Amino acid sequence: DLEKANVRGARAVIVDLESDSETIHCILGIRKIDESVRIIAEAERYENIEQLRMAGADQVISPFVISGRLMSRSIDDGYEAMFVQDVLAEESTRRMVEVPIPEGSKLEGVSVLDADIHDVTGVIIIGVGRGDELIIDPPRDYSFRAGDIILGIGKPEEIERLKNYISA
C-alpha cells in the first residue's frame, strides 16, 4: 500500500501515526521499498527514539519529549521554555536559521577566530554541519569550507546581514 502512495523516489517521507507502534512499522515498510529516501519520523515516547533510528528514519523529531522536559522545568522559573516558544515555535523576534556557504565567498578556508561571526552580524552561532554531522559549538581551531551549513539564531534583519556577510 505504500507503493500505491509512491514512496519510491520522493523528496522526503514524513511519518507520523496514531502510536509509536505503527511509526516503526511504517518506516520498516518504506525501507523495503526505497533504502535512500529521507524519512522524517515523529517519536511519541522517549524510549522509542532509538528504535526509529535503527528502523531507518533519517531524522527523528520528538514533540512530547521536548514538551515533557519543558513542563517539568517551567514549574519554578520557566526561562528555558520561554526560549523554545519564542524562537523555535512562534518566531516572535528571533528565529533559528540555517544558511550555506557557497564556493569561495568571504569565508573559504578562514578560521572562526578572525571570521568575527557574532559581532558584525548579531546572530548567535550554534553549530556548523558538514554532511549530516552537526558540530555544535565549533572550537577556535576550526576552518570553514564550502558546503558547510551554518546554524544560527537571530532576528530577520540580522540573518540578511549574515547572508550578505557570507556572499561574495
Is residue 156 at the binding interface for a second copy, with CB under 8 A as the rule?
A: no
Number of alpha carbons in the 13 Å side-chain half-sphere of residue 120: 11
Is residue 84 at the binding interface for a second copy, with CB under 8 A as the rule?
A: yes
For 48-97, give the DSSP string: THHHHHHHT-SEEE-HHHHHHHTTSSTTTT--SHHHIIIIIIS-SS-EEE
Q: Which of 126, 142, 161, 165 binds a second copy (CB under 8 A)?
A: 126
Q: Smallest gap, in angstroms, from Cβ of residue 121 to a second copy?
A: 11
Is residue 93 at the binding interface for a second copy, with CB under 8 A as the rule?
A: yes
Q: Which of 77, 114, 141, 157 binds a second copy (CB under 8 A)?
A: 77
Q: In this structure, are residues 55 and 28 in contact, taking their beta carbons and an 8 Å threshold? A: yes
Distance (Å, rounded) from C-alpha 36 to C-alpha 53?
14
Total chain residues near a second copy (CB under 8 A): 77
Is residue 56 at the binding interface for a second copy, with CB under 8 A as the rule?
A: no
Give the CA distances from residue 78 to residues 62, 64, 73, 89, in Å, rounded to whole numbers and listed in that order: 20, 17, 6, 16
Scanning residues 2 to 21, which ones bind a second copy (CB under 8 A)? 4, 11-12, 14, 16, 19-21
Q: Which of 8, 73, 145, 160 binds a second copy (CB under 8 A)?
A: 73
Please state the residue numbers annotated as binding site for Ca(2+).
Answer: 16, 42, 44
